[PDB]
């Protein structure tokens, strides 16, 4: 409408979003000022796994906002405790450290990994190393961005943060070689998101962990995108039956209603933080907690993890039928799916918009398919057919 | 009410909070499970300038929570535009770049300064420098933490981000000496919060700004805590009639209801960012925007800036009547006040809790006094009497 001109007037150009304006949203559907409905196949990059404005989650926001929304970390809220306990049980880890955004939580992992390496592993001072994977995405803060293997995210941002090593994704021998006695941690996505939903070979996560165990290196899993039922299991590590040394959670942790993230690990790792060493102003505020608790209850109570598992499977099977040379591969776990093409994907993304489906290309060749895990069978079937009309 | 037993079990040790639990907050008053009411003289570290749960801000939370809360930055929202505009008009700057937390907005500033130093100033590649001040608090993320002059926030956190230089605070000469042709920016708090509410000499900011203009160095003011009426003026720079090359805002920008922050500068500075170079999932979401817009409307409509200026001057005057050699100085602007002692301040903070006032000392010997800007004259008078009983 005129919202775009107004945005272009005072708006920093760090983004170049589609000319579409969303003014309403519920479940998997979104609406513009004119009233055109679209189905969300992006799930806000997996933040709205419970659908847009889930009533139980919205009512949580509304209820906590009637009590208190911000107690400085100087004092206790009456929601942080319960939230800790719910996340601690879900991750089967001893302590939980709340932050606001994914990057913050990743940054927290950087700090946690390093001090552990020094205080506990007794690695040479200032000599700690962190293995990361190529084509990863962990955030935009200086610590996180220093990890990217995309020089566009790193161009002219001054001296980057030292002590980072990058290896090919899904490569066990690369990992083995990169490890030195100064290696603090190995941080990777169970499934690389922005990299094109590329799934590592089967059991790799179980093999990667065993390597890190032997070398006394922390195995840190970034599940901000893949965690919480997205991939058909509570965590994407569950596919290889792996319990990582530290979970990093975010996005869907707050149902897309409130930004809340966290690092979860046992007291031998997190315990390295003494009072005053780390934190933030909003991290673990009662509004985020109450909303997160509700978002996690929706997950289990409505069995969205299993709902994702089964429907995701069905759709991948339905998609693998579409006969065309253009389609290099259909891959995915649960409702975390990607379609790779030997052509660019943007044109077909435009064709899908015109039909009422919203999704965004990552890596050009691949089309994202990540609807809310609450999506009905009918709506999923209606979606499959629109995709078939365009890709056939 | 033993919520703490629950927090200790699964909680990380980066915070050692007072044993008190807040289950309800409204205006300047907070309340524990038992029913005991306290006055918040901390304002959640200056985030609830508008008081706890201001009805018009909670009202904006609900209205927007019935439309849409998270649209990926892959699409427009109908709240971002109007918010940009309201912040551009307030800062009198050409473009705005939204984030979620202060640390994020600072990290954004870091990336901006460097890219501008390379792209515009044409400094030598990967040799860009940034000047900061001793005892600064700019955040917890790796970039912000790298700026700290406190070794406890930096202990065992691996190789720190290079390209950061530290000078004394309020030292015009130090600044002059520290600037080289590779210096990108100079980032400072118009008043250092955590360092003990220490104000720089009068006109120091105006002089520093000039030193910066003549050296083509960005004058970046971190107003995350001092900004938005806290110090009796819309911005703390306004005391020296200074317009910085860039503002960094946060905390109260969202009225303590939703974490939102931003970097404000003209296009010759933020124009540096082309699409895809920066961003964040929740940064600039419609929910934070709707809430921030209400937060700013409350500030001006209720004239909290002036209400802070007048009550702040009155209180400082009153506190200076208290005769005790213990008191080294009483200093402040608006309601951003600190009382320095020659003894440790913690004991007197405890006495105050028992008197119904909540604050936390900083720099050991400084008692923070910073109640919400909505505090009524009566309640401020009552507060003074309690403080007088403790410090006399």
SS3 A249: strand
Dist. CA B136–CA B180, nearest whole Å: 21
Q: What is the DSSP letter of A187?
A: E
Q: Name every chain B residue with its beta carbon within 8 A of the beta carbon of A250.
A: 281
Q: Which residue from A140, A273, A282 is facing B259, i.e. has the nearest CB?
A: A282
**What phi and psi values does residue A247 have, to the nearest 5 degrees?**
-90, 140
Residues 6+ apart with CB under 8 A from A68: A77, A286, A287, B22, B23, B24, B25, B30, B52, B53
- Does the distance separating the beta carbons of A14 and B275 come in below 8 Å? yes
| Residue pair A170/A200 in contact by the 8 Å Cβ criterion | yes
- Return the residue matching tokens 């602007």: B333
B36: left (phi over 0), alpha (psi -120 to 50) or beta: beta
Closest CA to B240 of B197, B203, B282: B203
d(CA B182, nearest CA chain A) in Å: 11
d(CA B283, nearest CA chain A) in Å: 9
Residues 6+ apart with CB under 8 A from A209: A219, A242, A244
Sheet with A24-26: strands ordered across: A24-26, A29-31, A37-40, A357-358
Structure tokens at A250: 């975010």
d(CA A203, nearest CA chain B) in Å: 30
Distance of CA B10 to the CA centre of its chain: 29
Name which of A7, A18, A70, A92 to mutate to probe chain B: the one with the most chain B Cβ atoms within 10 A of its Cβ: A70
Dist. CA A46–CA A362, nearest whole Å: 14
d(CA B388, nearest CA chain A) in Å: 23
| Residue pair A210/A186 in contact by the 8 Å Cβ criterion | no
Angle between helix A286-301 and A304-319 (nearest 10): 60
- Does the distance separating the beta carbons of B280 and A155 come in below 8 Å? no
Instruction: Convert chain B into a string of H (helix), E (strand) and C (coil).
Output: CCHHHHHHHHECCCCCCCCCEECEEEECEEECCCCCEEEECCHHHHCCCCCECCHHHHHHHHHHHCCCCCCCCCCEECCHHHHHHHHHHHHCCCEEEEECCHHHHHHHHHHHHHHHHHHCCCCCCCCCEEEEECCCCCCCCHHHHCCCCCCCCCCCCCCCCCCEEEECCCCHHHHHHHCCCCEEEEEECCCECCCCCECCCCCHHHHHHHHHHCCCCEEEEECCCCCCCCCCCCCHHHHHCCCCCEEEECHHHHCCCCCCEEEEECHHHHCCCCCCCCCCCCCCCHHHHHHHHHHHHHHHHCCHHHHHHHHHHHHHHHHCCCCCCCEEEEEEECCEEEEEECCCCHHHHHHHHCCCEECCCECCCEEEECCCCCCCHHHHHHHHHHHHHHHC
Name which of A4, A6, A12, A49 to mutate to probe chain B: the one with the most chain B Cβ atoms within 10 A of its Cβ: A12
**What phi and psi values does residue B98 have, to the nearest 5 degrees?**
-80, 140
Distance of CA A134 to the CA centre of its chain: 17
| Residue pair B7/A96 in contact by the 8 Å Cβ criterion | no
Dist. CA A83–CA A111, nearest whole Å: 23
Structure tokens at B49: 């300038």
| Residue pair B319/A138 in contact by the 8 Å Cβ criterion | no
Query: Beta strands B37-40 and B357-358: pairing type?
Result: parallel
Angle between helix A3-10 and B80-91 (nearest 10): 30
- Does the distance separating the beta carbons of A161 and B281 come in below 8 Å? no
C-alpha distances in Å from residue B260, one per residue of A74, A340, B75, B175, B235: 20, 36, 19, 31, 17
Structure tokens at B212: 């910066």
Closest CA to A101 of B225, B50, B105: B105
Taking CA atoms, what residue in B is nearest to A110? B157
**What phi and psi values does residue B385 have, to the nearest 5 degrees?**
-65, -40
Q: Name every chain A residue with its beta carbon within 8 A of the beta carbon of B143.
A: 141-143
Closest CA to A192 of A340, A18, A319, A39: A340
Dist. CA A93–CA A216, nearest whole Å: 18
| Residue pair B235/B90 in contact by the 8 Å Cβ criterion | no
Dist. CA A387–CA A325, nearest whole Å: 16
Dist. CA B17–CA B19, nearest whole Å: 6
B301, exposed or middle or buried, with CB in 10 Å at 0-12, 13-18, 19+? exposed
Structure tokens at B147: 């700026």
Closest CA to A221 of A183, A263, A251: A263
Dist. CA A69–CA A286, nearest whole Å: 6
Longest dimension (CA), chain B: 61
Taking CA atoms, what residue in B is nearest to A280? B140
Taking CA atoms, what residue in B is nearest to A112? B157
Dist. CA B36–CA B25, nearest whole Å: 11
Tell me chain A's radius of gyration from C-alpha atoms.
21
- Return the residue matching tokens 């390093």: A114
A89, exposed or middle or buried, with CB in 10 Å at 0-12, 13-18, 19+? exposed
SS3 A233: coil
Dist. CA B304–CA A210, nearest whole Å: 59
SS3 A116: helix
Dist. CA A142–CA A150, nearest whole Å: 14
Closest CA to A188 of A167, A211, A160: A167
Dist. CA A191–CA A175, nearest whole Å: 16
Q: Name every chain A residue with its beta carbon within 8 A of the beta carbon of B227.
A: none
- Does the distance separating the beta carbons of A22 and B68 come in below 8 Å? yes
SS3 A37: strand
DSSP conformation letters of A267-331: HHHHTTPPTTSS--SSTT-HHHHHHHHHHHHHHHHTTHHHHHHHHHHHHHHHHTT---TTEEEEE
Q: What is the DSSP letter of A240?
A: G
Torsion of CA A225, A229, A235, A238, to 10 degrees: -140
Q: Is the dihedral of CA A117, A120, A123, A126 positive or negative?
A: positive
- Does the distance separating the beta carbons of A78 and B3 come in below 8 Å? yes
| Residue pair B131/B168 in contact by the 8 Å Cβ criterion | no
C-alpha distances in Å from residue B215, one per residue of A282, B115, B186: 37, 17, 11
Q: Is the dihedral of CA A229, A231, A232, A234 positive or negative?
A: negative
Longest dimension (CA), chain A: 61
Burial A178-196 (b: 16+ CB within 10 A, else e): bbeeebbbbbbbbbbbbbb
Name which of B48, B71, B153, B285 to mutate to probe chain A: the one with the most chain A Cβ atoms within 10 A of its Cβ: B71
Q: Name every chain A residue with its beta carbon within 8 A of the beta carbon of B16.
A: 275-276
Dist. CA A302–CA A50, nearest whole Å: 9
- Does the distance separating the beta carbons of B97 and A101 come in below 8 Å? no
Closest CA to A135 of A123, A147, A120: A147
Q: Name every chain A residue with its beta carbon within 8 A of the beta carbon of B82.
A: 6
| Residue pair B130/B124 in contact by the 8 Å Cβ criterion | no
Closest CA to B268 of A12, A178, A352, A7: A12
| Residue pair A381/A28 in contact by the 8 Å Cβ criterion | no
Closest CA to B41 of B58, B28, B23: B28
Task: State the Cα angle at A132 between B100 and A186, rounded to 5°.
Answer: 100
Structure tokens at A120: 């506990």
Dist. CA A57–CA B365, nearest whole Å: 43
Q: Which residue from B15, B126, B259 is facing A158, i.e. has the nearest CB?
A: B126
Structure tokens at A167: 């290896």
Dist. CA A219–CA A112, nearest whole Å: 12
Distance of CA B41 to the CA centre of its chain: 15
Closest CA to B76 of A301, A362, A21, A215: A21
| Residue pair A153/A146 in contact by the 8 Å Cβ criterion | no
Dist. CA B35–CA B357, nearest whole Å: 15
Q: Which residue from A10, A78, A107 is facing B96, i.e. has the nearest CB?
A: A10
Instruction: Determine which helix (DSSP H) or strand (DSSP E) holds A157, and give its type and residue range.
Output: none
Residues in chain A whose C lies over 2.5 Å from the next residue's N (breaks after): none
Closest CA to A190 of A201, A180, A179, A175: A201
Q: Is the dihedral of CA B239, B243, B245, B246 positive or negative?
A: positive
Q: Name every chain B residue with its beta carbon within 8 A of the beta carbon of A160.
A: 161
Resolution of the entry in angstroms: 2.7
Task: Give the domain B1-53+303-392 fold.
Answer: 3.90.1150
d(CA A388, nearest CA chain B) in Å: 24
Other Cβ atoms within 10 Å of B20 Cβ, number:
18
- Return the residue matching tokens 């009805």: B55
Dist. CA B179–CA A265, nearest whole Å: 43
Closest CA to B72 of B286, B364, B314: B286
Torsion of CA A278, A280, A281, A285, to 10 degrees: -100
Residue A145, CA atoms < 13 Å, CB-side half-sphere:
27
A151, exposed or middle or buried, with CB in 10 Å at 0-12, 13-18, 19+? exposed
Residue A155, CA atoms < 13 Å, CB-side half-sphere:
12
Tell me chain B's radius of gyration from C-alpha atoms.
21
Task: Give the domain A54-302 fold.
Answer: 3.40.640
Dist. CA B150–CA A194, nearest whole Å: 37
C-alpha distances in Å from residue A9, one per residue of A303, B84, B364: 45, 9, 46
Q: What is the DSSP letter of A73?
A: T
Other Cβ atoms within 10 Å of A32 Cβ, number:
17
Dist. CA A331–CA A19, nearest whole Å: 29
The runs of H, that is alpha helices, within chain A are 3-10, 43-46, 55-64, 80-91, 102-119, 142-145, 172-178, 204-214, 267-270, 286-301, 304-319, 346-355, 377-391
This structure was determined by X-ray
Distance of CA A239 to the CA centre of its chain: 16
Residue B54, CA atoms < 13 Å, CB-side half-sphere:
31
Residues 6+ apart with CB under 8 A from B210: none
Taking CA atoms, what residue in B is nearest to A93? B10
B92, exposed or middle or buried, with CB in 10 Å at 0-12, 13-18, 19+? exposed
Give long-range contacts, CB 8 A cutoff, 24+ apart: B381-386: B382/B39, B383/B39, B383/B41, B383/B357, B384/B315, B384/B318, B384/B319, B386/B352, B386/B355, B386/B356, B386/B357
Dist. CA A374–CA A358, nearest whole Å: 16
Q: Name every chain A residue with its beta carbon within 8 A of the beta carbon of B53.
A: 65-66, 68-69
Residues 6+ apart with CB under 8 A from A378: none
Closest CA to A121 of A181, A208, A175: A181
Residue A10, CA atoms < 13 Å, CB-side half-sphere:
21
Other Cβ atoms within 10 Å of A43 Cβ, number:
31
C-alpha distances in Å from residue B168, one per residue of A239, B188, B247: 54, 11, 21
Residue A75, CA atoms < 13 Å, CB-side half-sphere:
30
Closest CA to B187 of B214, B173, B169, B202: B169
Q: What are the extents of the domains in chain B?
A: 1-53+303-392, 54-302
SS3 A377: helix
A386, exposed or middle or buried, with CB in 10 Å at 0-12, 13-18, 19+? middle
Q: Name every chain A residue with its beta carbon within 8 A of the beta carbon of B67.
A: 23-25
Closest CA to A218 of A253, A201, A237, A243: A243
- Does the distance separating the beta carbons of A107 and B69 come in below 8 Å? no
Task: Please provide the size of chain B in residues.
Answer: 392
Other Cβ atoms within 10 Å of B154 Cβ, number:
16
B125, exposed or middle or buried, with CB in 10 Å at 0-12, 13-18, 19+? exposed
């Amino acid at each position: 409408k005129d919202i775009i001109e107004l945005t272009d007037t005072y708006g920093a150009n760090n983004y170049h979003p589609l000319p579409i304006v969303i003014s309403k949203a519920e479940g998997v559907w979104v609406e513009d000022p004119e009233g055109n409905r679209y189905m969300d196949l992006l799930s806000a990059y997996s933040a709205v796994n419970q659908g847009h404005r889930h009533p139980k989650i919205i009512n949580a926001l509304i209820d906590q906002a009637n009590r208190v929304t911000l107690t400085s970390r100087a004092f206790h809220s009456d929601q942080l405790g319960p939230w800790y306990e719910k996340v601690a049980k879900l991750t089967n880890k001893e302590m939980v450290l709340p932050m606001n955004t994914g990057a913050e939580a990743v940054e927290t992992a950087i700090k946690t990994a390093r001090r552990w390496a020094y205080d506990v592993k007794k690695v040479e001072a200032n000599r700690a190393e962190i293995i990361v994977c190529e084509d990863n995405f962990h955030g935009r803060t200086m610590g996180a961005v220093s990890m990217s293997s995309n020089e566009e995210y790193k161009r002219g941002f001054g001296p980057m943060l030292p002590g980072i090593i990058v290896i090919p994704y899904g490569d066990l021998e690369a990992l083995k070689a990169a490890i030195t006695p100064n290696t603090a941690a190995f941080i990777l996505e169970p499934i690389q998101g922005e990299a094109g939903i590329n799934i590592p070979p089967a059991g790799f996560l179980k093999e990667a962990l065993e390597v890190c165990k032997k070398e006394n290196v922390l195995f840190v899993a970034d599940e901000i995108q893949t965690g919480l039922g997205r991939t058909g299991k509570v965590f994407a590590c569950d596919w290889d039956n792996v319990t990582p040394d530290m979970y990093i959670l975010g996005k869907a942790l707050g149902g897309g209603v409130f930004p809340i993230s966290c690092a979860a690990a046992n007291r031998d790792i997190l315990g390295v933080f003494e009072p005053g060493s780390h934190g933030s102003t909003f991290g673990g505020n009662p509004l985020a907690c109450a909303v997160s608790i509700a978002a996690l209850e929706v997950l289990e109570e409505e069995k969205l993890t299993e709902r994702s598992l089964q429907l995701g499977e069905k759709l991948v099977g339905q998609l693998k039928e579409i006969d065309n040379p253009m389609i290099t591969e259909v891959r995915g776990k649960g409702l975390f799916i990607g379609i790779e093409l030997n052509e660019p994907a943007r044109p077909y993304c435009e064709q899908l918009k015109a039909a009422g489906l919203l999704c965004k290309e990552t890596h050009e060749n691949v089309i994202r398919i990540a609807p809310p895990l609450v999506i009905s069978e009918e709506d999923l079937e209606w979606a499959f057919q629109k995709i078939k009309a365009v890709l056939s």
